[PDB]
Structure 1
Amino acid sequence: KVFGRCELAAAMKRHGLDNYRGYSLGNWVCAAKFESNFNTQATNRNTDGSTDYGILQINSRWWCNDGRTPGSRNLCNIPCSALLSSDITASVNCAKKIVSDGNGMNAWVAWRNRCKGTDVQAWIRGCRL
């Protein structure tokens, strides 16, 4: 599914991600923008045997089990395929676990490069929230 910017804002707010561990809603929308371009099917094969899955590009070595990643730890205890659906639930619940791991949103390289200390609240203006 390709989300609308505001469609995704509303959806992330409904799954309790406004200010989840200090991170305003704009950080999450901005993150999805530069990780996946709002695409729930985005996948990115890495050269280390791992793949990043879905709207928030969650990694198959630490977080989800894709069944082809050596050393898989599956800390969100889900299959990576759950992170490729139209419904963002499994990706949000995993993201909440990642962002609580101790390194906040820096887990997300695209967020770090393109979002972190910008005007992130620009990603949620012109939206019904």
Structure 2
Amino acid sequence: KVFGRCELAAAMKRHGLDNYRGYSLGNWVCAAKFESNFNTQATNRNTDGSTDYGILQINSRWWCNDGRTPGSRNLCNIPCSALLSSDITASVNCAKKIVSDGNGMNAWVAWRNRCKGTDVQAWIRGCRL
């Protein structure tokens, strides 16, 4: 599913991300924009052989099982395919664990590089939510 901007914002808020661990909704929308262009089906292979899945490009190195990342962990206790669903629940719940693990949203390098420090409220401006 490719979400619209405001549509994703709404969904994220319904699933409990608005201000989760102190990160406003525009932070989460901005991260999703640059990780996946709001596409739940996004995947990208990392040169080491792990893969990133879904709207928030969650990495099989640590967070999900895809059967093809030697030595990895599955801390969210889910198949990586769950992160590709049109329903964002699995991605949101796993993101809550990631953002809680000590480094906040810096876990998403693209958030650090393209969202952190910017006017992230622009991502939710005007939305009905």
Equivalences, count: 129
Percent of pairs with identical residues: 100
CA shift for structure 1 position 8: 0.1
1:94 alignment counterpart: 94
CA shift for structure 1 position 118: 0.5
Which ranges in structure 2 are unaligned for 5 or more consecutive residues?
A: none
2:26 alignment counterpart: 26
Q: TM-score, normalised by structure 2?
A: 0.99
CA shift for structure 1 position 68: 0.5
Q: State how far apart, in whole Å, the 2-side matches of 1:110 and 1:72 are.
A: 22
CA shift for structure 1 position 115: 0.3
Matched, 1:125 2:125: yes
1:5 alignment counterpart: 5
Q: TM-score, normalised by structure 1?
A: 0.99
CA shift for structure 1 position 71: 0.9
What are the within-5 Å matches in structure 2 for residues 1-129 of structure 1? 1-129=1-129
CA shift for structure 1 position 19: 0.7
Q: State how far apart, in whole Å, the 1-side matches of 2:101 and 2:93 are.
A: 13
CA shift for structure 1 position 110: 1.0
Q: State how far apart, in whole Å, the 1-side matches of 2:72 and 2:89 are.
A: 22
Q: State how far apart, in whole Å, the 2-side matches of 1:24 and 1:64 are.
A: 25
Q: After the TM superposition, list the runs of 4 or more consecutive aligned residues in structure 1 that deviate by more than 6 angstroms.
A: none
CA shift for structure 1 position 126: 1.7
Q: SS of the residue aligned with 1:49?
A: coil
Q: State how far apart, in whole Å, the 1-side matches of 2:31 and 2:6 are.
A: 14
CA shift for structure 1 position 43: 0.3
CA shift for structure 1 position 91: 0.1
